[PDB]
Amino acid sequence: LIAGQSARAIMAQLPQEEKAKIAEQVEIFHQEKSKLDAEVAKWDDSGNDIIVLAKQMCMIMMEMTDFTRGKGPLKNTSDVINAAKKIAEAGSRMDKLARAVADQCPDSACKQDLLAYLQRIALYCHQLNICSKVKAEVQNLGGELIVSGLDSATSLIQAAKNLMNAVVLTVKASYVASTKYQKVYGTAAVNSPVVSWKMK
């Protein structure tokens, strides 16, 4: 018929071999995403923006990886680039909250883990941006022109997985830091905790 010429449509018709390798890599990302599904389900995001943000970031990352399989709401490469900017704004906001939480944390070692994770978020947000220009491209394989999108895809996906892991680790670790605050100063502490960890 009259096939689409959009970037998304093109990714959808990559050579089978490459679609296979991309699925392998998407799976690995999916595994790291379920750990986030698991941890995020525990709680009720009212009064906890860290959780909301983590959900937003998860969602936008799903769109980005879907793009590489030729699916999802992102049509053009510029949409993927924009998606990556959204994630970075989100990640920056979270950074403001989690940093507040560590500034309540009185257990200097618990403060540690949250801070180190926070900089992984900055780092992989960044690398996600750098890797966001995903596009099939023309290549020359021994005098034969082919179309490949594998490397561009896998680069994005890896950055997405790495980011996901850092988000999970940041959600967990900021929870732990919140408890260490409550354990020490009790629910009747004058300064209420930065985020509320309700269980619903």
Three-state SS string over 22-41 comes to: HHHHHHHHHHHHHHHHHHHH
Distance CA 137, CA 158 (A): 19
Tell me the Ramachandran region of residue 46: left when phi exceeds 0, alpha when psi lies from -120 to 50, beta otherwise: beta
The residue extents of the domains of the chain are 1-200
DSSP string, 61-77: HHHHHHHHTT-SS--SH
Backbone angles phi, psi at 139, to 5 degrees: -135, 160
SS3 44: coil
d(CA 178, CA 102): 8
Tokens linked to 7:
């970037």
Q: How far apart are CA 114 and CA 93, in angstroms?
A: 15
Decide if 52 contacts 61 (C-beta within 8 A): no
Number of H helices, E strands in the chain: 6, 2
Contact 129, 61 (CB under 8 A): no
- What architecture (CATH level 2) is domain 1-200? Up-down Bundle (1.20)
Token code pair at residue 38: 């698991």
Q: Which residue has the tokens 């986030």?
A: 36
Q: What is the resolution of this structure in A?
A: 2.6
How many Cα atoms within 13 Å fall on the side-chain side of residue 31?
Answer: 7
